[PDB]
């Protein structure tokens, strides 16, 4: 806290959807103590062994003969560290990995796979510390979530349908900050996905609801978008002090 | 930040500037100097620009488009095709080749835009280099009319012949390593 | 819109991205205040 540098404290763009923008302590700890957003989830960690076995099965020749070769072997498969080999085809591997994430064979919902198309590197991180949030999946311009899923969830009890079933269907996905860098998001399905003057026609995900970017204390603030930003931090602080 | 941009020059203000003044810090964050012009140079923009050029530090690197080191066995051989003409001109009445010539050639090429912006002259640059370094560096300069502004630098002629050194016949820093050291020195320290 | 401009007024209500950018600006202001308090106090003690 003693350090006066106004750089560790500032609200980074990457904090979007994973740490509450408004809720921060004020004083020596401005921007140094943060609070999870409402929908944020933190990885509990997993063994990387099955992912490595899958990569070995697909291709990812290791101990190759200087085959990177001006990254002719597109991408270099990394895991939680550990360059573990490289693949000639990097789009097929990524798509196969997403399908596996859906079927939940080798990829738990938390396993995070990042492809940097330039720099040719895929990172496949499962390291127990990543903060990730649920985002809906957009195929073409259509959300995968449909009336069947919503109707079943509406009948939730005595229908034995829950959030985990929504994840299993592949309708929703957990995306961490690294993946948030490689994903085109739409705030709303109707306003953004639908055809208009084409800003983007390659949306890959959609926010479940914008308001979730706020934390527990900031969520109580009514009409927070109509207030000055410091006034929401103050309300977070004061709501921690309300009597009830 | 939030300072009004009256001029394109940043200035420390507020608490940090008060800290600098009160501490009498030897190193100000933004040391700046306001210069007022005595004569008609103040009224006329061209003379003021002349003063600006005279008051602004310019290194050879700022005006140098690209530098190359070619091993040229003979000056007449002219490994670079382009210099063949102007080398010939200079070697129609060769000067300072009597001692010898260096077998290595540093063919620096200057950007015309930077030269004309700073209003530098090929004779000016060549005089600064040759005079400051001494007779050891011999420089051939292109005509400004030529499309490429080329300065051909060679190591000491007497040093190449080794009659002047006498002593022991042992290479010091080879010649190409010495030429690279010369190039770095020129890039950052010419102070043209 | 991409780099931070908020066309909506407070009464109209900020759009989500405008909301996050506004939060970034307010956070910078708060950090400035908190950091300023200690440096100014040290200066004042020295002068006195």
């Amino acid at each position: 806290r003693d350090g006066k540098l106004a750089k560790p404290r500032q609200l980074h763009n990457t904090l979007w959807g994973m740490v509450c923008p408004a809720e921060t302590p004020e004083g020596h700890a401005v921007g140094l103590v943060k609070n999870l957003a409402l929908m944020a989830y933190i990885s509990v960690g997993s063994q990387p062994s099955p992912i490595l076995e899958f990569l070995e099965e697909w291709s990812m020749e290791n101990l190759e003969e200087i085959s990177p070769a001006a990254i002719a072997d597109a991408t270099k498969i990394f895991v939680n560290g550990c360059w573990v080999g490289i693949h000639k085809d990097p789009e097929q591997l990524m798509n196969t990995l997403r399908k596996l994430r859906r079927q939940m064979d080798i990829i738990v919902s938390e396993v995070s796979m990042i492809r940097d198309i330039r720099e040719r590197e895929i990172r496949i991180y499962t390291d127990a510390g990543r903060i990730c949030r649920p985002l809906l999946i957009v195929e073409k311009q259509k959300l995968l979530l449909k009336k069947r899923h919503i109707d079943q969830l509406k009948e939730r009890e005595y229908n034995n349908y829950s959030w985990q079933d929504l994840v299993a269907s592949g309708v929703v996905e957990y995306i961490d900050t690294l993946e948030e860098e490689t994903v085109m998001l739409a705030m709303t399905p109707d306003d953004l996905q639908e055809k208009e003057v084409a800003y983007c026609s390659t949306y890959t995900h959609c926010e479940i609801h914008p308001s979730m970017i706020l934390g527990v204390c900031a969520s109580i603030i009514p009409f927070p978008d109509h207030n000055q930003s410091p006034r929401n931090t103050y309300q977070s602080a004061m709501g921690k002090q309300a009597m009830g | 930040f939030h300072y009004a941009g009256v001029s394109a020059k940043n200035v420390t203000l507020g608490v940090p500037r008060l800290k600098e003044l009160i501490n009498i810090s030897k190193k100000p964050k933004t040391p700046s100097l306001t210069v007022f012009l005595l004569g008609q140079s103040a009224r006329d923009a061209e003379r003021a620009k002349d003063i600006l050029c005279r008051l602004e530090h310019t290194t050879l690197r700022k005006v140098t488009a690209n530098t190359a080191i070619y091993y040229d066995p003979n000056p007449q051989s002219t490994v670079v095709a382009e210099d063949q003409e102007w080398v010939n001109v200079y070697y129609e009445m060769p000067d300072f080749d009597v001692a010898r010539i260096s077998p290595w050639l540093l063919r620096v090429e200057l950007d015309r835009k930077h030269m004309t912006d700073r209003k530098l002259t090929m004779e000016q640059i060549a005089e600064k280099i040759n005079a400051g370094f001494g007779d050891d560096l011999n420089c051939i300069f292109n005509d400004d009319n030529a499309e490429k502004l080329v300065l051909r630098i060679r190591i000491m002629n007497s040093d190449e012949n080794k009659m002047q050194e006498e002593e022991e016949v042992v290479d010091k820093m080879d010649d190409d390593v010495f030429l690279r050291c010369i190039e770095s020195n020129m890039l950052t320290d010419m102070t043209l | 819109e991409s780099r931070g401009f908020v066309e909506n007024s407070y009464l109209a209500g900020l759009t989500p991205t405008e909301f996050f950018f506004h939060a970034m600006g307010g956070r910078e202001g708060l950090i400035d205040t908190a950091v300023k308090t200690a440096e100014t106090g040290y200066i004042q003690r020295r002068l006195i």
Partner: peptide, 8 residues
């Protein structure tokens, strides 16, 4: 939060 010349 206003502009570059104002406040954040």
């Amino acid at each position: 939060i206003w502009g570059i010349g104002c406040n954040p």
